[PDB]
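Can you give me the bound-state structure? Components:
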Amino acid sequence: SGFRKMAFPSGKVEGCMVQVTCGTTTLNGLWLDDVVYCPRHVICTSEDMLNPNYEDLLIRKSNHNFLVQAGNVQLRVIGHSMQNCVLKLKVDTANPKTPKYKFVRIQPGQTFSVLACYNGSPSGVYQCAMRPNFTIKGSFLNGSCGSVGFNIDYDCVSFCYMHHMELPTGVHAGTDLEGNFYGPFVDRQTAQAAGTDTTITVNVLAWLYAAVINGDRWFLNRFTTTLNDFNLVAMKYNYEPLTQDHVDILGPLSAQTGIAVLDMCASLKELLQNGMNGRTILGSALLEDEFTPFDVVRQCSG
Amino acid sequence: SGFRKMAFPSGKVEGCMVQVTCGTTTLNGLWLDDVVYCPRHVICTSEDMLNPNYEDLLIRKSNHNFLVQAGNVQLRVIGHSMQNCVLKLKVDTANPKTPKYKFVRIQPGQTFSVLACYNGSPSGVYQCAMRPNFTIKGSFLNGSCGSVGFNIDYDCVSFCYMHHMELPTGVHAGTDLEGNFYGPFVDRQTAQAAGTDTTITVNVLAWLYAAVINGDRWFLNRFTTTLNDFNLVAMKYNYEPLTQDHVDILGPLSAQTGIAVLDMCASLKELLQNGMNGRTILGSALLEDEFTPFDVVRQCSG
Ligand SMILES: CC(C)n1cc2cc(Nc3cc(=O)n(Cc4ncn(C)n4)c(=O)n3Cc3cc(F)c(F)cc3F)c(Cl)cc2n1
Ligand SMILES: CC(C)n1cc2cc(Nc3cc(=O)n(Cc4ncn(C)n4)c(=O)n3Cc3cc(F)c(F)cc3F)c(Cl)cc2n1
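Here's the bound-state model for the whole set.
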């Protein structure tokens, strides 16, 4: 197909990555104005990591225990606090590369760009989606803790994810920039399982709209459905139910193609019930669920 | 610990993107030190684009016919020349964000990051490969002309691609930074086909090693093959030959996984002859060929 996982240009975020070290424990942090944000796990020694008491651990730290570096350049820490699972270190220098920014908490299905970093040095950028079980299928090595995920709209970086940990199945878990985990996970080095995942229905529908835009439309039928009936069927096939917000974000694709959202729902319901019977959509037998309606419009229309 | 198409961080290149305008024709340029590089197609009017005589068109221009804009700042052009299909505009100010850089010509099968840009403004970043038929399967829209492809090694940006055009099939053609096309194409608005494409065998093997590293092993078998006998089958299926150099560069991945290169070849041979019978590898329903061995080593080990 002519669709790629495309990331946002990463330069605005690259200019904000720093390294934070407490003793020998080291990870990545995010320097915006005169504050550095990073996972509070940095304050753990190896022996603390299993079952940390973060209040007690933080109480015994002072500003002079935190080594924050921009490249090789040390930034002096002049205050510290903890908000949920994020440490906030106030530094004596406002980052001159700070972009316009927001902190946002995203829903499952939403996509974002990840800047994978090691020792405060950006290494790679890629797009990924928040799964319905609140994990991401990222690509992260040891030392990636504190890498961030983001979108860029207008000229403003919306930070939505800070990476904390790998789960036993190789998927990834983390927090928003206010330190609240996505999903039921905790920041301790214990085995935590993600729940069973489901397919992101709103994104599958966006993919079907993308196929229509490109002239691949064999799956359009003469039926419609109600949203409630569709949701009840979807859940029988391990598909997420649609929300009212999902119907709304499909609006532009519906308008562009002239296909009502609930008619697309009826078409997807036929595919769930009957399978693709050997046919392909956009050259594939698999339905893509990590392109949002906004991703589709970006790549089709710019 | 996950496998994604990962691009280089784009910030070093973002700082070099400008807009170039000649008359009403406009596209993207690359500002390094005191020179702006862009496709010479920019000197064409609408009527010229169908069948341009570029040396004629260029002698009919002066420095003041070129408008170069870097954000809200106009750069004064104080000289111009052509190098093959690349226009070089000397400006009166050096770019302070110029990275350390080189111009390189890549080989089919090699990968690079693309920074897609519109009207001099970076819009997205993604990884792609130079196809054996010297096209690229990019994500590019109208106005992307002059976007660049690059790799980053240490702190040095190696520019390898400058985007020119989309072919009727929806794939893309462009030049190196010395203005030579990859492939049999010309910078004329006329329908151009590429040669028949093949699959990049060494890259498929690298990606199968990535699959094994990430625990996806169903396709392994215990057949063995010689390099020659694998190559006879590969060529039958429109796969590129595997050379001894290819075998050598897969060595690190062979060592890591304990799977001899020719044992992986025997696995690939079976996949070509039998298909993947509805199964996936690393979530893909088809054999992926846009990851090089180095790509896999970098993403799976650092
Ligand atoms: C001795 C010094 C140098 N030192 C050791 C450290 C170990 C740490 N623990 C983690 C680091 C990390 O990068 N990741 C992310 C990840 N993504 C994919 N892979 C494979 N790894 C982790 O998951 N962890 C474990 C972990 C991190 C948490 F934030 C958490 F709440 C629980 C965890 F189990 C770290 Cl962070 C620093 C180290 N420094
Ligand atoms: C403002 C007005 C006066 N104006 C119109 C222009 C048209 C131009 N022509 C192209 C622009 C472009 O971005 N792309 C790349 C691309 N990638 C995917 N898509 C769908 N399009 C093109 O392929 N072209 C066509 C094209 C470009 C060449 F460099 C070439 F040698 C032959 C071509 F047919 C341009 Cl470049 C500027 C324009 N300005």
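A couple of observations. The helical segments of chain A are 11-14, 54-59, 201-213, 227-236, 244-249, 251-257, 261-274, 293-301. Chain A touches chain B through 38 residues (CB under 8 Å).
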